[PDB]
């Protein structure tokens, strides 16, 4: 495993260990998002704003329907066969999304048999259930605003103001919509489109959608904020101006024999100067295989690191040896900033750079001094039952590692500069050194 | 200092000099954000949407309260002793934030003595002042929407529609809230959470919060947009569904003998080709020490660069020598983009790549020609009182540097490619060159 003692001497104090779990096995529910409100109760005070809105929304939704019927007409049952000659160019994800789209078309047709009922909806959330075959939920984009504000104010304000307000609400809805459903949606076939983005067709109210679908669980927020709950547009209507979206609700399957180890970057002292070690702060270990993880795209939770797909990335052999004990191969960067972490706590044991912070022991009153040959000091109850570092007073546990931690020095790694301009500078210097040697 | 003449010949025309100032010495005000509106005036038809909202909000807020009582029960007076054995794993910032939390608990209890008054609030902004001990402001998340829209429309619409509107408003509030207070808030103990993020518990209205607190000053916008005004959740109520937040309002102290120098990247000519210099455009010089600055996280203002943290990062010795005069160590990248800056103005003196743009002088009518051995041309009133650069006609001052600027050539640095794929390609080539040499 990782050599946590030498890493802590380097300033990589080990943190909490988190489970590795990935989105898997998605269950499908189909919903209807009607992108035009019902203005039947205020039709006499509507004007031509609805026709302009219909034209604009048709222009927006026509490319989406075209991209869908790229895969509708080129995919058929056989048990799902595509004419890849007609499709021409596609990726694996896009082809799998086309399979999912063709699988969803049967329920899309079952829903489209309720086209008139979808058109007749006059509430923001309407459940359509004629038989067990057709049990869909319809969400209307601006119906609540109509029924709450504009209809009660028909007799209170001049109806030209009502028309202007309806036009402004529709245009604001289109402004919020175009960030997601505009030309940014080049590939509506893909099912990686999250439910937050699709909720922009409902004014950004994904909470209403998912609470109505009945997804309230303890892992619901984890699936929500890890971008695991995604949806796919499976049908676009250019006459009634609604879309049918297949919402994919997955389960978080834990990756077995896998864990993410977090390292806390404590600055350490060397050569009368302060350094921080340039290592990955999160290390994914699966089947004792040490590798990097793109944890920026993953949700980090106290129990687990939650990802919507496997973000494991390769790691150099030099960093793997750094993490397994070869501290001489660990790059270090100078500390010019005065706000980088000076100390950290792990298992009740404090690892501090007491050159930079005034460590002193409350039990004895003596200052905890660090020598020039010590990168950090391990402070535990054997040497200091209660340590004080400025404004904090902390009681400490006992270190489970070597009792000679503070007397056992280690080899140190090469200095680095991680700024991208300085990265180009070092590449220039190494290239010129190679040319001089050659 | 920096050798601005050679840098300008390289195309790094010096810009404005800005002070370095950092957030320091925060003053604390405690506020209450009641996360559930008072629906008493429409209680006869709120339905069960309020109980569902309470269940959802309790599920959201329970992890936050648990994370707080991790540090409530493990911190006590000594004079603030913390039980590091029970906490186990923590960072310096997290421990300091827990100490600040325990410091704020006394005012949290003083406020919680007004629990019934907080529950009884029926306005979006309510000032609670029984005695001088308890002078807290309470902000209610959706109270204004209730009092303005739903209560007046009780008799105007069938208030089942009012129930639906209330449910939709609460769900939209939760949708806006979950981006900040959901599982993304893994560490609510930290006090680095900005007031913009906390205002999402008030619907994103941080202006109301900070105007009500009376933080109106000339530096208020600078503190706001530099993420210097931050708050810390100090108490969570799972029965009345409110939080007590300690808002930290700091002062922007100036870093003495420190300044950030901006360089304007003018493209320059060499070998019948156009180049830009790969140097940091902002250089932080503190006590004559030249270093990089992560200015992406800081607010840049005409007077100063404003930071919530010391974002100074180290600089390579080669780049420091580039900035101090060694132009042969300055990396340069080819120009393929036809939209990179061709010229710039500094102190009324124009530094232009007249190979790429048609420089000409209005005073004499003669075109300002650049030779193949010149990287740029310095255009000043000694050689051209008024220069023309197409649609731009500009009057120019006198250069304070060398009078032989245009006749004194310089050494040029190595070409580079800064694309990350090209970075991997150059690392591949240097590694293979090393293996061939070895």
């Amino acid at each position: 495993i990782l050599h946590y003692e030498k890493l802590s001497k380097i300033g990589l104090v080990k943190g909490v260990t988190r489970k590795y779990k990935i989105k898997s096995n998605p269950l499908t529910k189909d919903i209807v998002i009607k992108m035009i409100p019902n203005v039947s109760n205020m039709s006499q005070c509507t004007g031509s704003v609805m026709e302009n809105y219909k034209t604009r929304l048709n222009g927006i939704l026509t490319p989406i329907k075209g991209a869908l019927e790229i895969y509708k007409n080129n995919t058929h049952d056989c048990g799902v066969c595509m004419a890849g000659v007609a499709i021409g160019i596609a990726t694996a994800a896009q082809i799998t999304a086309g399979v999912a789209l063709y699988e969803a078309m049967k329920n899309a047709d079952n829903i489209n048999k309720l086209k008139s009922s979808i058109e007749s909806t006059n509430e923001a959330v309407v459940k359509l259930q004629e038989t067990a075959e057709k049990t869909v939920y319809v969400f209307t984009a601006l119906q609540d605003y109509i029924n709450t504000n504009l209809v009660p104010t028909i007799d209170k304000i001049p109806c030209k103001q009502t028309e202007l307000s309806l036009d402004l609400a529709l245009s604001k809805y289109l402004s919020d919509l175009l960030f997601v459903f505009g030309p940014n949606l080049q590939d509506p076939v893909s099912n990686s489109m999250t439910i937050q983005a699709i909720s922009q067709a409902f004014g950004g109210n994904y909470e209403t959608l998912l609470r109505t679908l009945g997804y309230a669980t303890e892992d619901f927020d984890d699936l929500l904020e890890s971008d695991s709950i995604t949806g796919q547009i499976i049908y676009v209507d250019l006459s009634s101006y609604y879309i049918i979206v297949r919402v994919y609700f997955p389960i978080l399957t834990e990756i077995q024999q896998a864990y993410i180890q977090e390292l806390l970057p404590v600055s350490f002292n060397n050569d009368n100067s302060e350094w921080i070690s340039i290592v990955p702060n999160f290390i994914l270990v699966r089947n004792t295989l040490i590798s990097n993880i793109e944890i920026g795209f993953c949700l980090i939770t106290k129990r687990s690191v939650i990802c919507n797909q496997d973000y494991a990335t390769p790691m150099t052999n030099n960093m793997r040896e750094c993490l397994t004990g070869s501290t001489e191969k660990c790059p270090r960067e100078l500390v010019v900033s005065s706000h980088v972490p000076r100390f950290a706590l792990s298992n009740g044991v404090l690892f501090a750079n007491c050159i930079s912070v005034t460590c002193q022991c409350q039990t004895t009153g003596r200052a905890i001094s660090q020598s020039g040959e010590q990168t950090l000091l391990m402070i535990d109850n054997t040497t200091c039952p209660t340590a004080v570092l400025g404004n904090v007073i902390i009681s400490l546990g006992k270190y489970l590692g070597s009792v000679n931690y503070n007397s056992e020095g280690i080899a140190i790694g090469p200095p680095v500069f991680t700024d991208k301009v300085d990265i180009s500078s070092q590449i220039s210097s190494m290239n010129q050194s190679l040319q001089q040697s050659k | 200092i920096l050798h601005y003449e050679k840098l300008s010949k390289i195309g790094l025309v010096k810009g404005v000099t800005r002070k370095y100032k950092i957030k320091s010495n925060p003053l604390t005000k405690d506020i209450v954000i009641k996360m559930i509106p008072n629906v008493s005036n429409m209680s006869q038809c709120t339905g069960s949407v309020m109980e569902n909202y309470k269940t959802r909000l309790n599920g959201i807020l329970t992890p936050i309260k648990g994370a707080l009582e991790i540090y409530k029960n493990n911190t006590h007076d000594c004079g603030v002793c913390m039980a590091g054995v029970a906490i186990g794993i923590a960072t310096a910032a997290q421990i300091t934030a827990g100490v600040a939390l325990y410091e704020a608990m006394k005012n949290a209890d003083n406020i919680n003595k007004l629990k019934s008054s907080i529950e009884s609030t029926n306005e979006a902004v309510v000032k609670l002042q029984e005695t001088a001990e308890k002078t807290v402001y309470v902000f209610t998340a959706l109270q204004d929407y209730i009092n303005t829209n739903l209560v007046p429309t009780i008799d105007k619409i069938p208030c089942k529609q009012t129930e639906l509107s209330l449910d939709l408003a609460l769900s939209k509030y939760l949708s806006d809230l979950l981006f900040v207070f959901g599982p993304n808030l893994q560490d609510p103990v930290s006090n680095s959470m900005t007031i913009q993020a906390i205002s999402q518990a008030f619907g994103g209205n941080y202006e109301t919060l900070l105007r009500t607190l009376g933080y109106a000053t000339e530096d208020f916008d600078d503190l706001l947009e530099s993420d210097s005004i931050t708050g810390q959740i100090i108490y969570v109520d799972l029965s009345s569904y409110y939080i007590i937040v300690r808002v930290y309002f700091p002062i922007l102290t100036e870093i003495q003998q420190a300044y950030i120098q901006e360089l304007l990247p003018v493209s320059f000519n060499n070998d019948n080709s156009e180049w830009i210099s790969i140097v940091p455009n902002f250089i932080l010089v503190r006590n004559t020490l030249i270093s990089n600055i992560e200015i992406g996280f800081c607010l840049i203002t005409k007077r100063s660069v404003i930071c919530n943290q010391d974002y100074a990062t180290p600089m390579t010795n080669n780049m420091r020598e580039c900035l101090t005069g060694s132009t042969e160590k300055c990396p340069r990248e080819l120009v393929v983009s036809s939209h990179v800056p061709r010229f710039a103005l500094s102190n009324g003196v124009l530094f232009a790549n007249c190979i790429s743009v048609t420089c000409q002088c209005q005073t004499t009518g003669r075109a300002i020609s650049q030779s193949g051995e010149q990287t740029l041309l310095m255009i000043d009133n000694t050689t051209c009182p008024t220069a023309v650069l197409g649609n731009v006609i500009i009057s120019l001052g006198k250069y304070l540097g060398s009078v032989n600027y245009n006749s004194e050539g310089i050494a040029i640095g190595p070409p580079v490619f800064t694309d990350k794929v090209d970075i991997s390609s150059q690392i591949s080539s240097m590694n293979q060159s090393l293996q061939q040499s070895k």
Partner: antibody
Amino acid sequence: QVQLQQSGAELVRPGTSVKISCKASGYTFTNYWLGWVKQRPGHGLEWIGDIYRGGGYTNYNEKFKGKATLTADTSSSTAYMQLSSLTSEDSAVYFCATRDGYFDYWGQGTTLTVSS
Amino acid sequence: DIQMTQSSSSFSVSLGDRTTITCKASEDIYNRLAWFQQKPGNAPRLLISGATSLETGVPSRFSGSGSGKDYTLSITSLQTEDVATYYCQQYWSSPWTFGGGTKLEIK
């Protein structure tokens, strides 16, 4: 290798309280849920409550809320279940088990017998 | 609370024959199911996590499946070590509920 070592079987008089312990050892992950499950003869498994060794809160079954009290000691990784006002129907085998939704690793079980 | 009901308190299946244990939830739990095997005198051991995913130590003869409210644990070839009580646990809603327990027996 994960082991959840529980306290031995207890013979407790009615009306008094018992405090069953469960020391989790060998668990890789720092923060986890730890649930308590009751198993009576003639009855299925009955979940009592979950203690969260990560965030400082706990879930209780509404049947067992107030009856049971879950506490945890993060230093020794030992959690406790205080059962108060024991009666004859409280005699059961009690299992501590880490869970991630599903109960993953189970303790060997503490047989509690309430009789006079 | 989600009531978890198993088909029978006990089944008698001959050795080598396929054994089917079914569990019905009161409401849709969306594959948030677990299957546990408990021999007498021992703690339950996890067989299936989710509807279908096997535990790494479980033999491949244990197969989990299910949709909606109905779920099924299948033993393709019953052995003498599989004679135990099988419990279905739901972990969809906050009160975690187990099944009635299916005490498997040999004819």
